[PDB]
Amino acid sequence: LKARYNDELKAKLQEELSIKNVMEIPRITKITLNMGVGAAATDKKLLDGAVADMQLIAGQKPVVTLARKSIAGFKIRDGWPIGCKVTLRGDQMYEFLDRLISIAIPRIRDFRGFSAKSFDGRGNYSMGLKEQIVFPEIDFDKIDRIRGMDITITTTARTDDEGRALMRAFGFPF
Amino acid sequence: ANFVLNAQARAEDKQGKGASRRLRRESLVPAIIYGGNAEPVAVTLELRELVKALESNVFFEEVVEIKVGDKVENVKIQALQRHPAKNTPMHADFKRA
Amino acid sequence: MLQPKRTKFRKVHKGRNTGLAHRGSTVSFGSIAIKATERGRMTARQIEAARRTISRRIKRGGKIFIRVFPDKPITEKPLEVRMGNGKGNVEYWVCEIKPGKILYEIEGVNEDLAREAFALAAAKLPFKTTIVTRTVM
Amino acid sequence: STKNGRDSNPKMLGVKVYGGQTVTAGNIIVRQRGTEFHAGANVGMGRDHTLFATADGVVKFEVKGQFGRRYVKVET
Amino acid sequence: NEKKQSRLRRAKSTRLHIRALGATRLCVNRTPRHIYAQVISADGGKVLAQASTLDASLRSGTTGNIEAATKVGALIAERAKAAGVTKVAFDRSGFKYHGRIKALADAAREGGLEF
RNA sequence: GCUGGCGACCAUAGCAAGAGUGAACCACCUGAUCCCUUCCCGAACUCAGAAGUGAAACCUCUUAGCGCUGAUGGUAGUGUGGGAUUACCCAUGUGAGAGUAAGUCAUCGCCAGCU
RNA sequence: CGGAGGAGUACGAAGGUGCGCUCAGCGUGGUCGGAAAUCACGCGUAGAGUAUAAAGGCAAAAGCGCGCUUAACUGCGAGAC
């Protein structure tokens, strides 16, 4: 996107939401991708498979996430790997955003999963997408156990309405 | 007007712990008067007069008059100290009204 | 038998009972109250007995506020034991009473009945008491 | 039989030189388990939080700083 | 806003150590547009020499890169030699010792201050 | 009279709410070619620059809203001599804490720019 | 022979230095995932931590990471407790 956003959506959203100054036009700052792969301690291979998955889906190297505090109810320890996370900004973030919105959403069997709600009350949106499939990589064959992704778009928008407006302008279904 | 208390000046040699105890042994009550635009004034009151005034309910909400000779003050009751076991009043505060 | 649910320590020093009760000497919850005039100790059984007498007399027509709690443990030796060999065992709990401390308050009854109940209760206590009523200041 | 009956030897902590006294370099000013007093000018701190004078002069206590710490210093 | 707070937090330790040591300080400041350098006495409340790219001789240039910082360092060195200060402690004020500030420090060192 | 830096001081100086400032300075701001950088990300650090904005931020102003400061008088305690033993009284010296009246939206120093 | 607790160890890094970073709690949303795993954003706030008992301490953090290393050196030592 990038240039397309800068050309159209800036002025379009400015006149749509009636904002006086340019500096507070809503923008997207970062996108975070997470796989909370619990109980990786037993297998030690699903986690490194997940990091590979992240590497193919987004052209950035993942960083494994260590546990904070130990809980008896679960089996996690003080500081051992229990997850993986990635952050995307700049042109790579616009890329991932477009190649996700245009392609992945029609692919999945169900539809209308993402409601116009679920903003955190300050203009940032969170979604969960199931199955590493529907992404530009190999299908159920040549992959390890299936996995799910959490996608968070963090915006400069102050209110949920302004966040919704920015997302629908790009083409978020709801 | 309706409530009037006759008082005498309480001097520095009449202030303190032992002096106050001697005054109460003589059946008197120490009081202080403070308020806007004037310095505090220390006075002595009669125990029977104070008890009689406190028995009435209008004493706590009406302007009272304290007369030390020629000097006259119009004040409201502000704070009162009582003995923990005998309930006898021990010291009084008066805010200028 | 009032007693703390748990304590930080089990045994405490004897101490000394001195001074007056400047705190807890004003009628706050009800309209009429009974307060101590000389110092002493009050046990949980004494508290229970006085409460039972007051409640029985007033027939539970008003509300009784108890303002003393026995948070001090007292120990004793097992009997026929020589001096030394450690501190004794906790037997009962007491509250220290200073002159001017209010023990019971009653809300919602006539003064004649409240005074008669307080007179009934005062015969169960190991120190002298008196009756007070609420006042503006 | 009691399970109590132990205690440790005394340690002799506290202030050794008070305000207004003259010192020579090396004199110990405060013995302390933690840092109740902090080192000001011409005062050094040992590995066990002892405060000592590093120059001749007169001892002076004060309260200073944004945290309200107690300082001791030596004026030459 | 945590940017400036983090910078001051980073500068605190070096400033306190210099104050405890009791030496003359050479302090620098850097913005996207300008760079500044002042020499401060031991007490910390008086300045002896100063230099910046706001100087009339230098304000006409680009003012925001290594080349300007070089002459800023030369100027502060030559002005401090006039005041008679020789030994100083460099205070980077929470910045990294890299790029423009490193150039300014090298220029002052060639100017004659030893540190 | 404004702006920046460095100190004295550490709430009577702080928080909170509301309102202003772009000439200069500062701040966001452009992109990432070289220096440099992230257990990933030009988000921070760094470099090369002025097309935009004072929106945010930082400063300045107003408010007693929260907080903070705080008398006088009295009470508790207490050294010495005397009188008594549920821990008080007298002579003499000393004197809180809590609470009340009231106060407060700081005050100074060195240097450099702009009027 | 009063009332309560600990020790008879550990560590070549858990030592040195340069540079860098702040805890805990609650609330929102977000797959399995919930009372409580990880992600993002807020609110008030030292209640976290410090190999180990308690106490005195801890923002230049004495708490937490990374690179390089052996000052866990030799001869001493004014002056003090």
From Swiss-Prot, chain A:
Gene Ontology terms: biological process: translation
Keyword Chaperone tagged: no
Keywords: Ribonucleoprotein, Ribosomal protein, RNA-binding, rRNA-binding, tRNA-binding
Molecular function per GO: rRNA binding; structural constituent of ribosome; tRNA binding
GO CC field: ribonucleoprotein complex; ribosome
Cited function: This is one of the proteins that bind and probably mediate the attachment of the 5S RNA into the large ribosomal subunit, where it forms part of the central protuberance. In the 70S ribosome it contacts protein S13 of the 30S subunit (bridge B1b), connecting the 2 subunits; this bridge is implicated in subunit movement. Contacts the P site tRNA; the 5S rRNA and some of its associated proteins might help stabilize positioning of ribosome-bound tRNAs.
Similarity comment text for this entry: Belongs to the universal ribosomal protein uL5 family.
Subunit structure: Part of the 50S ribosomal subunit; part of the 5S rRNA/L5/L18/L25 subcomplex. Contacts the 5S rRNA and the P site tRNA. Forms a bridge to the 30S subunit in the 70S ribosome.
Listed name of the protein: Large ribosomal subunit protein uL5
Organism: Acinetobacter baumannii (strain AB0057)
Gene that this polypeptide is encoded by: rplE
Curated annotation (Swiss-Prot), chain C:
Record function comment: Binds 23S rRNA and is also seen to make contacts with the A and possibly P site tRNAs.
Keywords, ordered alphabetically: Ribonucleoprotein, Ribosomal protein, RNA-binding, rRNA-binding, tRNA-binding
InterPro entries in the cross-refs: Ribosomal_uL16, Ribosomal_uL16_bact-type, Ribosomal_uL16_CS, Ribosomal_uL16_dom, Ribosomal_uL16_sf
Record lineage: Bacteria, Pseudomonadati, Pseudomonadota, Gammaproteobacteria, Moraxellales
Molecular function, one GO term: structural constituent of ribosome
A GO cellular-component term linked to this record: cytosolic large ribosomal subunit
Protein known as: Large ribosomal subunit protein uL16
NCBIfam families: rplP_bact
The species this protein was found in: Acinetobacter baumannii (strain AB0057)
Any one GO BP annotation for this protein: translation
Subunit structure, as described in the record: Part of the 50S ribosomal subunit.
CDD domains: Ribosomal_L16_L10e
Family: Belongs to the universal ribosomal protein uL16 family.
Swiss-Prot record, chain D:
GO BP term, pick one: translation
Signal peptide: none
Record InterPro entries: Ribosomal_bL27, Ribosomal_bL27_CS
Sorted UniProt keywords: Ribonucleoprotein, Ribosomal protein
Listed GO CC annotations: cytosolic large ribosomal subunit
Domain of life: Bacteria
UniProt-annotated stretches for the region Disordered: 1-12
A GO molecular function held by the record: structural constituent of ribosome
PANTHER family registered for this protein in UniProt: LARGE RIBOSOMAL SUBUNIT PROTEIN BL27M, RIBOSOMAL PROTEIN L27
HAMAP family the record matches: Ribosomal_bL27
Family classification: Belongs to the bacterial ribosomal protein bL27 family.
Name listed for the protein in its UniProt record: Large ribosomal subunit protein bL27
Organism of derivation: Acinetobacter baumannii (strain AB0057)
Species classification: Bacteria, Pseudomonadati, Pseudomonadota, Gammaproteobacteria, Moraxellales
Swiss-Prot record, chain E:
Annotated family: Belongs to the universal ribosomal protein uL18 family.
Example GO molecular function: 5S rRNA binding
Keyword terms, alphabetized: Ribonucleoprotein, Ribosomal protein, RNA-binding, rRNA-binding
Identification of the protein by name: Large ribosomal subunit protein uL18
PANTHER family: 39S RIBOSOMAL PROTEIN L18, MITOCHONDRIAL, LARGE RIBOSOMAL SUBUNIT PROTEIN UL18M
Protein species of origin: Acinetobacter baumannii (strain AB0057)
Oligomer and partners: Part of the 50S ribosomal subunit; part of the 5S rRNA/L5/L18/L25 subcomplex. Contacts the 5S and 23S rRNAs.
One GO location term (cellular component): cytosolic large ribosomal subunit
Protein role: This is one of the proteins that bind and probably mediate the attachment of the 5S RNA into the large ribosomal subunit, where it forms part of the central protuberance.
NCBIfam families: L18_bact
Gene name for this UniProt entry: rplR
GO BP terms, alphabetized: translation
SUPFAM superfamilies hit by this protein: Translational machinery components (SSF53137)
One Pfam family from the record: Ribosomal_L18p
Domain of life from the UniProt record: Bacteria
HAMAP family reported in the protein's UniProt record: Ribosomal_uL18_B
